[PDB]
């Protein structure tokens, strides 16, 4: 269907911008909202409102930049907001090595349903966050099966 | 108005984007649609659609990543496209020391009532192209004064 074939190109267009920034080891914070809606964090960022791209995506993480600091936040399909705030989790629970980027992520998880991906800046690692959970050093695979899943 | 406030807006975030550009001698090239349509240059890029901020146009330019090479193309107070293809203008009314960027930014200005401004890479300096003309080493006062009047 026409809902299915764009789906399936946005998890195309995610999964090759985090394999650009895995290889590059740049540092990078993607939060897909679900259920729970996230305005309030949405309206924290940059509005963008834009299409989905991993071009657009790259360009968004490259550091020192304007928009590489905070989380890029996806709604319907589109790039809602870039540089936006995650609260940062208080878990006793995540590895000690990791820094602020992931404990957004699980924050944000730990409040709503969303789906968010971290590229680490120390090792290129890619892991998801969900429900609390932090899921580390996926393979490109992994990270595929956690979004056709979600 | 609000249409004339959010005009305001867009300019204020074109010329910030556009100054610490030149500053940086980060290269640039941005063409505003005006009353003749541009879709068929929009199409030869990627696709955007994105709300317009100072942020994302300074992103999109930083050199060496996957939008920088190419036009972006606004549409009132949209980005539409990035790395967008232009016709080369054959003037020799085009300083010889320039490159792709000017003459692209001359050739869209000879078919369309469009507003392009060009960062140079090599020195910083901002012209801007309408009509067949290019017009070098604008201050920031010159430029925005003729956003402003388009
Ligand atoms: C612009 C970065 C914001 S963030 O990526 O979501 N991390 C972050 C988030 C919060 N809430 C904070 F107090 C400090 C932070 F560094
Ligand atoms: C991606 C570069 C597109 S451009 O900025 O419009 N420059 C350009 C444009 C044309 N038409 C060309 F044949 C070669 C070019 F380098
Ligand atoms: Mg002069």
Chains 1, 2 share one sequence.
Do not use: W
């Amino acid at each position: 269907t026409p809902v299915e074939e764009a789906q399936q190109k946005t998890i195309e267009a995610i999964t090759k911008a985090i394999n650009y920034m895995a290889k590059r080891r740049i540092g990078a914070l993607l939060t897909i909202e679900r259920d729970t809606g996230m305005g309030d964090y949405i309206e924290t960022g940059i509005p963008l409102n834009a299409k989905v791209s991993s071009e657009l995506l790259i360009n968004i993480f490259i550091p020192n930049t304007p928009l590489h600091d905070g989380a890029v936040i996806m709604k319907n399909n589109e790039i809602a907001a870039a540089a936006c705030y995650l609260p940062l989790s208080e878990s006793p629970f995540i590895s000690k090595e990791l820094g602020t980027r992931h404990r957004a992520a699980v924050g944000i998880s730990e409040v709503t349903d969303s789906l968010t991906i971290i590229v680490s800046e120390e090792t290129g690692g890619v892991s998801v966050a969900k429900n609390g959970d932090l899921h580390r050093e996926l393979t490109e695979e992994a990270l595929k099966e956690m979004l056709e899943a979600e």
